[PDB]
Amino acid sequence: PEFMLLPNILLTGTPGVGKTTLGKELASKSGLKYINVGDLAREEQLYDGYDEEYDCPILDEDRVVDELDNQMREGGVIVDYHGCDFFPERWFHIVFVLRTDTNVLYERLETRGYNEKKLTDNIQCEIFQVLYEEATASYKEEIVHQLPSNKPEELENNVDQILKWIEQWIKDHNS
Numbered sequence: 059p060e061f062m063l064l065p066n067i068l069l070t071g072t073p074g075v076g077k078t079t080l081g082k083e084l085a086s087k088s089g090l091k092y093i094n095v096g097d098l099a100r101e102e103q104l105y106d107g108y109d110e111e112y113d114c115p116i117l118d119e120d121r122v123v124d125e126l127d128n129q130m131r132e133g134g135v136i137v138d139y140h141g142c143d144f145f146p147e148r149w150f151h152i153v154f155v156l157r158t159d160t161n162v163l164y165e166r167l168e169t170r171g172y173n174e175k176k177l178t179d180n181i182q183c184e185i186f187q188v189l190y191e192e193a194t195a196s197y198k199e200e201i202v203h204q205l206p207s208n209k210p211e212e213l214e215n216n217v218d219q220i221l222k223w224i225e226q227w228i229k230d231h232n233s
């Protein structure tokens with residue numbers, strides 16, 4: 059991949075929709091680097107404060123941006139997070155909001171062992187389309203796309219679609 063301009067891709071959407079599954083498959087099949095923002099914050103200890111209601115450390119957004127910026131500038135990164143308003147807009151060439159039917163999503167999150175309050179907050183996040191609205195508010199409409207993420211066939215279609223998009227973008231930006 060030396061001396062090829064490569065795109066950056068954001069995968070966002072409610073926890074449980076399938077971002078990590080899709081991102082890891084995309085990385086394996088494209089050679090792009092996959093970054094799980096939650097995992098990165100854990101590894102590099104990028105937290106500031108604790109949230110009383112949700113019972114979780116608060117992500118230090120400025121430090122996450124600082125941690126990633128050099129790599130993002132170099133391109134070829136697939137970023138996975140359930141938030142997107144704090145990323146520099148320039149980072150991403152395309153943004154995918156994964157969507158899961160509420161009934162399907164509930165079953166996924168219930169199996170994670172989420173308690174009632176956490177289940178309800180996450181499920182309302184999806185049914186209010188919070189991440190979709192956050193994405194459209196943060197990035198140009200023409201680069202934001204919703205992807206269905208309910209069934210294995212849809213995962214396969216998503217992988218296929220995005221891999222094809224990567225190939226075209228590379229062709230267009232390495233004349």
Ligand SMILES: Nc1ncnc2c1ncn2[C@@H]1O[C@H](COP(=O)(O)OP(=O)(O)O)[C@@H](O)[C@H]1O
Pocket residue numbers: 071072073074075076077078079080166206207208209210211212213
């Ligand atoms: N398109 C899909 N069809 C069926 N199951 C899926 C799909 N995408 C993800 N899953 C499953 O749903 C669960 C949550 O996926 P995960 O990638 O951890 O979501 P996220 O990273 O958005 O929190 C996992 O058990 C995964 O195997």
